[PDB]
Amino acid sequence: SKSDQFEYAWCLVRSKYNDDIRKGIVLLEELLPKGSKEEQRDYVFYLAVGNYRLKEYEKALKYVRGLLQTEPQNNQAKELERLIDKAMKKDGLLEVL
């Protein structure tokens, strides 16, 4: 079912290993067209999470900015954007340090 596939992908994105994170991202992109309104919004949040944990901050930011245009009152999405911003800001500083 779709709920079990999501839970599997969710756990992959929270895994301690980067192979799993990348797999979970792939599975999440597969689930996305088959999803209801609410499901897709969930998938997108964890796609931004997974990309953030992989240091793919520009992709993470792309997803979270869309989520915020769809659900502007989503405080969890606001927090994740804040974190992505902080990470990219510091990465830029370190690049020329």
Ligand SMILES: *CC(=O)N(C)CCCN1c2ccccc2Sc2ccccc21
């Ligand atoms: C989120 C999490 O880690 N849970 C719920 C424990 C079960 C983890 N797995 C899992 C991990 C590694 C290999 C196989 C499986 S089977 C499976 C199926 C659906 C959801 C999670 C998990």
